[PDB]
Structures are given as C-alpha cells and as structure tokens.
Ligand binder design. Structure first.
Ligand code: NA
Ligand code: NA
Ligand code: NA
Ligand code: NA
Ligand code: NA
Lengths: 104, 101
C-alpha cells in the first residue's frame, strides 16, 4: 500500500500547495520510499493450487508473512500522511483528512 | 481480492468455461462471499489531532491485517476449489494468471 508520488497523488495534487510545501512533501515521500524499501520481504500459494492438495499450514504461513510485510508498509503510509499534514493550512488539512476518509 | 464474479474476473474469464463450469464456480463464489462476510470486523484521528498515537496506529493496523489474512485465505481457497472443475489446460492457465498477479 504505497502513496503515489506527490506529482501523481490525487490527495495532494488538488491542494494548490506552495513551492515550499511541495519541497517538504517530496522530501517526506523520498523518506517513505527509503523506509519501505528496508522492510524485509524474505511460489508457495501457486504450488498448493498446482498440486491439487490443500496445504493449510503453508497457506496460513505465506499469508501471515505477506500480511506482516504489508502491515509495516501501511505504518509508514499512515505516518507519511500524518507528517505531510503538518505543513498544511487548516483548510488543506481538512481536505486531506476528508480525502483519506473517503479512501477508508 | 475480493475476486469478481467469473465473467468479470481476469483470472478465469478467458478460460472459455462451459455453462456447467460457470454454474459451479459461481456457487463457489457465492460461498466465498458468505464466508468472507462472516469474518469478525483510529487513523483519521491522528491527522485531526495532530498528535501521533503509536500504539493506536499499530493496534488498528494489526486488527486490519488479521482480517485481510482471513479474507485472502478464502480467496486462495476459492481458486483452489475452482480449479478442481477445470480441465488440465484450463488449470494451467489459471496458475499462470495467478502467479502474474
Ligand atoms: Na481540482
Ligand atoms: Na534513498
Ligand atoms: Na494482509
Ligand atoms: Na465466464
Ligand atoms: Na495487511
């Protein structure tokens, strides 16, 4: 669950940010990318489909591994929008908060 | 995730399924939706508050992940069960589409 680049992000592109705001959020986004790339991501599901034999333990395990990774990624995504909103005016913040809610 | 009905699902729509195959896979799809609906089911506040709440963020994220784990389990189970009514050629195509996803 990655936030798009600010230039591509629907949540921020319609905010009418100043150049100073743009620079700060770009820095936050690079740092988001840096952090997520550091999350350890160490064919399982396809084999059980291919074998025709259900392997309950292997499925639960692979899915727990993937959920654990995604969870961590989502932690940084949440922080990213939290940090981003610090550089906003109250109006902009309310727009961001509303946009995030609509995404649910 | 959740998988669409067979006619709208990129993984199975190009398989050239028979009416008998479609009827069965749709019953599986119906059971999948039922099962997922039976899964027992914060972040906005931190934006509004401006105060980071680390424990609350992590809690919400753990609860959501536990749910998505369960939903993905049924999604995998769905394609496993689905493939039982397919021909060996169809079955191979489904595995290839899933890996790509
Ligand atoms: Na606009
Ligand atoms: Na870097
Ligand atoms: Na997950
Ligand atoms: Na179909
Ligand atoms: Na997750």
């Amino acid at each position: 669950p990655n936030p798009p680049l600010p230039a591509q992000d629907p949540i921020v592109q319609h905010l009418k940010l100043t150049n100073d705001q743009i620079t700060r959020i770009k820095k936050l986004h690079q740092q988001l990318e840096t952090d997520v790339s550091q999350i350890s991501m160490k064919g399982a599901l396809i084999e059980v489909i291919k074998s025709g034999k259900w392997d309950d333990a292997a499925v639960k395990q692979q899915l727990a591994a993937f959920s654990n990774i995604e969870q961590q990624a989502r932690y940084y995504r949440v922080k990213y929008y939290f940090d981003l909103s610090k550089v906003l005016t109250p109006e902009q913040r309310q727009q961001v908060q509303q946009d995030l809610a609509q995404a649910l």
